[PDB]
Amino acid sequence: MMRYLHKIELELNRLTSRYPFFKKIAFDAEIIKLVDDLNVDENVKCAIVAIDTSMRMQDFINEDNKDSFVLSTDVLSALFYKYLSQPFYQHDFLVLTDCVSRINELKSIRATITDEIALHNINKQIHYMFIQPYM
Amino acid sequence: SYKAFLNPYIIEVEKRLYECIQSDSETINKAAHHILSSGGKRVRPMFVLLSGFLNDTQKDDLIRTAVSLELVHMASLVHDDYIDNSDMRRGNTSVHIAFDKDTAIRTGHFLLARALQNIATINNSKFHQIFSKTILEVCFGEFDQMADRFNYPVSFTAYLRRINRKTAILIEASCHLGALSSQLDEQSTYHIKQFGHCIGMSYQIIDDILDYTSDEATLGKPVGSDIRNGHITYPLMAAIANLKEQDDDKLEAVVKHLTSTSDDEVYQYIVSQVKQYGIEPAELLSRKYGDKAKYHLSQLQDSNIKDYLEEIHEKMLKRVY
Ligand SMILES: [Mg+2]
Ligand SMILES: [Mg+2]
Numbered sequence: 158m159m160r161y162l163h164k165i166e167l168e169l170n171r172l173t174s175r176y177p178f179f180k181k182i183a184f185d186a187e188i189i190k191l192v193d194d195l196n197v198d199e200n201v202k203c204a205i206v207a208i209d210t211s212m213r214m215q216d217f218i219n220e221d222n223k224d225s226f227v228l229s230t231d232v233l234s235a236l237f238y239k240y241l242s243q244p245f246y247q248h249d250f251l252v253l254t255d256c257v258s259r260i261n262e263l264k265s266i267r268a269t270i271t272d273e274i275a276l277h278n279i280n281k282q283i284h285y286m287f288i289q290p291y292m
Numbered sequence: 293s294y295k296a297f298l299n300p301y302i303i304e305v306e307k308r309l310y311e312c313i314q315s316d317s318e319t320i321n322k323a324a325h326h327i328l329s330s331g332g333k334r335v336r337p338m339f340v341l342l343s344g345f346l347n348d349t350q351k352d353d354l355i356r357t358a359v360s361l362e363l364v365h366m367a368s369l370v371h372d373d374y375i376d377n378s379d380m381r382r383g384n385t386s387v388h389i390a391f392d393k394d395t396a397i398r399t400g401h402f403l404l405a406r407a408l409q410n411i412a413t414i415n416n417s418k419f420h421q422i423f424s425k426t427i428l429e430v431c432f433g434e435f436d437q438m439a440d441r442f443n444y445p446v447s448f449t450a451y452l453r454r455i456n457r458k459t460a461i462l463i464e465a466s467c468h469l470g471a472l473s474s475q476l477d478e479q480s481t482y483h484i485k486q487f488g489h490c491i492g493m494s495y496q497i498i499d500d501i502l503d504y505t506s507d508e509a510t511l512g513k514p515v516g517s518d519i520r521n522g523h524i525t526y527p528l529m530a531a532i533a534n535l536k537e538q539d540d541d542k543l544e545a546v547v548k549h550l551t552s553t554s555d556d557e558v559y560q561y562i563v564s565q566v567k568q569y570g571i572e573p574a575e576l577l578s579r580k581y582g583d584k585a586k587y588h589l590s591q592l593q594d595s596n597i598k599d600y601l602e603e604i605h606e607k608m609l610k611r612v613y
Contacts, residue, residue, distance in 0.1 A: 178438045215398070218397060223375055228375070230397070232428070234401065235427045238420070242424045244417050245416065245420050250408070254412060257408070261405065265318070268319075269318075
């Protein structure tokens with residue numbers, strides 16, 4: 158476990174302990190491995206993991222868990238914004254907020270397409286959204 | 293009037309708001325447009341603009357801050373409507389019904405993204421500290437509210453904390469951020485900041501009152517919607533207290549045992565008890581915050597901009613004044 162991973166886990170475990178309606182799902186394992194080796198600050202790594210987990214939570218939202226899951230994706234988005242605010246990481250902020258609008262755009266268009274290679278590719282782009290700009 | 297002086301800016305931010313929502317994604321563009329089309333009073337951009345006009349200065353940051361605050365405000369609405377099952381939004385249908393759940397959640401995150409994009413140009417850590425902090429506080433308030441559903445009693449402190457985070461802080465951030473993007477006097481920044489807080493508090497109380505006192509026409513949903521969804525608010529708290537003064541704790545007992553499966557008869561009883569015993573004290577409270585807001589307006593230098601704020605203070609708090 159890297160330093161940045163302890164930092165985010167500490168804050169997430171504190172939220173679950175304080176707010177029973179916050180649900181902390183497991184970080185994507187592949188995304189963690191990559192982030193581990195990224196050439197950026199501890200704070201940027203936290204923001205990335207925050208926002209990556211935020212968007213992956215979207216797919217698990219039902220009527221039976223929405224009063225939990227929706228708000229949870231929203232704190233994770235807010236944490237993402239917190240991590241890049243002090244000090245302000247302007248370039249990473251410009252890049253990753255772009256990734257946010259784009260990943261929602263890709264997921265929307267993904268809904269209206271059944272083609273094999275088209276689905277395989279857009280899924281790839283979606284899965285690596287927040288880490289590609291750093292590779 | 294205030295609509296006169298802000299008119300040029302209002303249409304400017306409105307124009308930029310539509311620019312920000314443009315998307316190479318078909319559904320999202322339509323969805324973002326759908327809620328942006330809905331009748332919004334754009335009250336938050338108004339507080340931003342007026343906050344920056346307290347001192348002599350012209351900046352691109354001022355109007356673009358107003359744009360981001362609107363985008364954030366609307367982002368929470370799309371998510372809120374879906375979470376709370378609110379199928380209607382001021383005559384117009386809500387996003388999750390007009391499209392679907394997935395689009396509803398996507399559009400919210402999209403609006404937030406673009407909102408963050410819009411202010412990414414402002415190279416100022418303090419600015420982002422404040423904005424990111426208020427967004428977090430809003431989230432925090434939402435978690436507690438969700439956990440407080442059908443959980444009596446709810447302390448007076450917890451209620452104030454609840455309405456502060458859910459309505460007050462964002463409006464306070466509008467006045468605070470609007471004042472930053474114009475390097476406003478600090479003593480003057482404190483007053484417009486506290487004004488934003490007090491006005492928001494007052495407004496949310498009034499809204500909590502109307503849930504009980506108004507008709508389904510001005511509410512867009514059934515009377516007593518808060519308590520029917522488990523939300524214990526000050527009017528109810530005040531009604532229970534007054535009844536206990538008359539040695540009657542039947543309302544307390546009922547609310548304590550209220551659950552998500554409670555009968556309509558129980559809600560109708562609660563609603564009528566609140567209308568009879570809880571309205572006046574809630575109005576009184578709202579007036580305290582209203583008055584406090586007046587003080588902060590009166591402690592800042594006399595000017596044209598002061599008059600606009602004072603006029604909006606009269607309108608928004610008409611129910612109590
Ligand atoms: Mg709500
Ligand atoms: Mg309400």
